[PDB]
């Protein structure tokens, strides 16, 4: 054997029932955006260059590999018609406000975590390069608590499956929020390194300070890059590739998990960044060039007309397949008005992240990376 890396094999996971799940009236988290993303992929003809699978509904036994039985059994039983009986237990598990109770809620968790664990065993069996599950990426879920629209943490479950055959796993979180659920689950171990780029300061979930580097055996294995409002493509690109490559050099993992939170795009309903799709997808290109078993997952994204743009192009990036900027016709062609074009343009907001601030945080994290 010889050679380095060429074109990669991709396995895509999607379930048709994922689009009908409804969080609530006026709730920003709309699972319908995944079906928009999948439908846009089909109309681009990208189904010819990838293997599409349907994820199984992950059983409660697979979920209890990280979560507790009290929290999992609660999710199986809670329904919109018997919430009053579970009023006290709804509050203990933070199920009610940001994480409301809707119809078929447990099945939605089974489809999300199913694609991540199915893609995990697919990578472990060495039958693909990248596994794509845009229904996953829910990174805020806790062991016995829900938060940030996340109920069951597919990422932690998918990484625990990778640990059966990969002694070191690298987790990358480009969601505008901090991956606090993934970071907390591996905060005291060196087998999993968590790296998260996020907006910090009076923003959900409040954690993510760069001074949190880990504890116990996992000290210096938790990298956080706090950011400010309105970061653009050049500011994100000048720090992503050098920091990711330094992690790949000092840590040298055997598997990568890249959470592609789309809420860090320009003009997001809940976000405040100013990234474009090309600037967002460039993060996938950097991780892809290292030629490691990658697990691409979804996550944030609340301007759904742009979420379908981002996760479609990033899928083509995984396929190394160029796609025209002119959007073809699709079932949801009305959402992409008034331009009906794939890529987007930045806003006029000010970049609160000065280039001198970007260099200082980068150099501060290089100090912790030398400690390996």
């Amino acid at each position: 054997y010889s050679q380095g890396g060429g074109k990669k094999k991709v396995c895509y996971y999607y379930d048709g029932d994922i689009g009908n799940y409804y969080y609530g009236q006026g709730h920003p988290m709309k699972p319908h955006r995944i079906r928009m993303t999948h439908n846009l992929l089909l109309n681009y003809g990208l189904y010819r260059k990838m293997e599409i699978y349907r994820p199984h509904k992950a059983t409660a036994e697979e979920m209890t590999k990280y979560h507790s039985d009290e929290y999992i059994k609660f999710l199986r039983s809670i329904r919109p018609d018997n919430m009053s009986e579970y009023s006290k237990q709804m509050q203990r598990f933070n199920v009610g406000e940001d994480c409301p109770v809707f119809d078929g809620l447990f099945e939605f968790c089974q489809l999300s975590t199913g694609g991540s664990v199915a893609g995990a065993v697919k990578l472990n069996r060495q039958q693909t390069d990248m596994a794509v599950n845009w229904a996953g990426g829910l990174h805020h879920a806790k062991k016995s608590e829900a938060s940030g629209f996340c109920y069951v943490n597919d990422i932690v479950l998918a990484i625990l499956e990778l640990l059966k055959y990969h002694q070191r796993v690298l987790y990358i979180d480009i969601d505008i929020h901090h991956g606090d659920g993934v970071e907390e689950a591996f905060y005291t171990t060196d087998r999993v390194m968590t790296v998260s780029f996020h907006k910090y300061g009076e923003y959900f979930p409040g954690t993510g300070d760069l001074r949190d580097i880990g504890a116990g055996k996992g000290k210096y294995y938790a990298v956080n890059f706090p950011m400010r409002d309105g970061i653009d493509d050049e500011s994100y690109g000048q720090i992503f590739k050098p920091i990711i490559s330094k992690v790949m050099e000092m840590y040298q993992p055997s598997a990568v998990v890249l959470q592609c939170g789309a809420d860090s795009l320009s003009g997001d309903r809940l976000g405040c960044f100013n990234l474009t799709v090309k600037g967002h997808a460039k993060c996938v290109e950097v991780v892809k060039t290292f030629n490691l078993p990658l697990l691409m997952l979804g996550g944030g994204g609340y301007t759904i007309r742009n979420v379908a743009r981002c996760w479609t192009y990033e899928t083509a990036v995984a396929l190394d397949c160029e796609i025209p900027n002119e959007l073809p016709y699709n079932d949801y062609f009305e959402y992409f008005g008034p331009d009906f074009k794939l890529h987007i343009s930045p806003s006029n907001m000010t970049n609160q992240n000065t280039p001198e601030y970007m260099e200082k945080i980068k150099q501060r994290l290089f100090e912790n990376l030398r400690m390996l």
Partner: peptide
């Protein structure tokens, strides 16, 4: 998460 309502 939602700044429209709540603290998340």
């Amino acid at each position: 998460x939602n700044p429209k309502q709540x603290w998340g």
